[PDB]
């Protein structure tokens, strides 16, 4: 939102599920790890 998505940054947010972070359609997505 307002600026473009980073994936190291998305990975840091998805770490809280134990997931793997990606960006998809300019929003962070966590996939099961």
Swiss-Prot record:
Tissue expression remark: Expressed by the venom gland.
Q: Which UniProt keywords apply?
A: Amidation, Calcium-activated potassium channel impairing toxin, Disulfide bond, Ion channel impairing toxin, Neurotoxin, Potassium channel impairing toxin, Secreted, Toxin
Question: GO cellular-component terms in the record?
Answer: extracellular region
* Kinase listed as a keyword: no
List localization entries: Secreted
For region [R/K]XCQ motif, the annotated ranges are 8-11
Q: Which residues carry this modification: Tyrosine amide?
A: 33
Q: Could you state a single Gene Ontology molecular function term?
A: toxin activity
Q: Does the keyword Disulfide bond apply?
A: yes
Between which residues do disulfide bridges form? 5-23, 10-28, 14-30
Q: What is known of its domains?
A: Has the structural arrangement of an alpha-helix connected to a beta-sheet by disulfide bonds (CSalpha/beta).
Q: What else is known?
A: Negative results: does not show inhibition on KCa3.1/KCNN4 at concentrations up to 50 nM.
Family statement drawn from the similarity comment of this UniProt entry: Belongs to the short scorpion toxin superfamily. Potassium channel inhibitor family. Alpha-KTx 05 subfamily.
Question: What function is annotated for this protein?
Answer: Blocks small conductance calcium-activated potassium channels. Shows activity on KCa2.2/KCNN2 (IC(50)=0.0243 nM), KCa2.3/KCNN3 (IC(50)=1.7 nM), and KCa2.1/KCNN1 (IC(50)=42 nM). Induces cell death when tested on human T lymphoblastic leukemia Jurkat E6.1 and human breast cancer MDA-MB-231 cell lines which constituvely express KCa2.2/KCNN2, but not on human peripheral blood lymphocytes (which do not express KCa2.2/KCNN2).
Name of this chain's protein: Potassium channel toxin alpha-KTx 5.4
Specify the species: Hottentotta tamulus (Eastern Indian scorpion)
- Taxonomic placement: Eukaryota, Metazoa, Ecdysozoa, Arthropoda, Chelicerata
